[model samples]
Target: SMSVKKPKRDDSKDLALCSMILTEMETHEDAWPFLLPVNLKLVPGYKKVIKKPMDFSTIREKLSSGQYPNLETFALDVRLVFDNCETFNEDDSDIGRAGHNMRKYFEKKWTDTFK
Candidate 1:
């Protein structure tokens, strides 16, 4: 009888991180930036300035397509999305607070995934 072999460790982390990003994207579109710069409700209508941001959907596609070589790289790219962000990197406003929370999510996932 042949046994079903599990996927390798890095692949495991890939799926998990992929799913985590997707679920967060769905639940927190406010936190996740759009592929194109767009309006966010937290900010003023006249101040409409959001990045054609590096968002989760793109990440998911990259993930599924095996663009990332390993978990570490993937995690870093995820972090870069927020760290390099022009919005939500602050703690002074609603969107900023949401960004902080999403960062916490990323941090937790990082520790869990890496460890």
Candidate 2:
């Protein structure tokens, strides 16, 4: 299978790093950010967002079909987080690693498809 050529507007397909700092530590219960930007909820019947998210197998089908009517309107809602990745390029911080890993992933996939 071939990879989708991402839109120019969506230059990076990286998931927002907002979920990185959340922890349930008893030592510092409130040490994390007050407002966690995203939410996940579980729902029955449909494969979709909820008050909590569920696994793929939780629904009747392993995959949902967008081939059906009205599904074309649906699109993934993703947001980007801004941080100076160059700030720690020389260090062992994961800030730079994210971009590096992402680039490597795309290059590998596209190369494999070409081969």
Candidate 3:
């Protein structure tokens, strides 16, 4: 089993981001439309107690200090969101299930855009 760290709440000195991920060991056969080894994670998070962009200054710090990047980067780092859905062609039968989730996210966010 993977050891996922729990988010903390105190003086806001640490990171507190929400995320979604795909289960490894199981892969999806539908695959992506574009030539993606995989897009890693597919969404972004908003911080708890911040203004404007909403995310705290610390998040930006991470991005600047080589802590963050595009989705591709997020995939390499965190697997809770976009990158969570890995296509494991080895053993599990849940290969195509990941598409169900990614599709759901798109449907919710792209409702109006679709029509």
Candidate 1: pairs in clash = none
Give a tens-digit lDDT track for model 1, residues 1-115: 2687776554555676656755665476565453433345555542444433455666677777878777767677666566645354466766566556677777775676556
> In TM-score terms, which candidate is top?
1
lDDT of 2 by residue, 31-86 (tens): 12112322334323323422232221221121133221221111111001112223
- For candidate 3, the lDDT comes to 0.33
Looking at model 3, report the run of 10 residues with the lowest lDDT sum: 17-26
Best by lDDT: 1
Q: 3-98, model 3: which lDDT tens digit per residue?
A: 876674342322222121222211334434211333235423323211222112223344447565443443333333232343322124444454
RMSD (Å) per prediction: 7.9, 15.4, 16.9
lDDT to native, each model: 0.60, 0.26, 0.33
Ordered from best to worst lDDT, the candidate numbers read 1, 3, 2
Q: How far does residue 31 in candidate 2 sit from its true spot (Å)?
A: 24
Candidate 1 stretches with Cα past 4 Å from truth are 1-53, 86-89
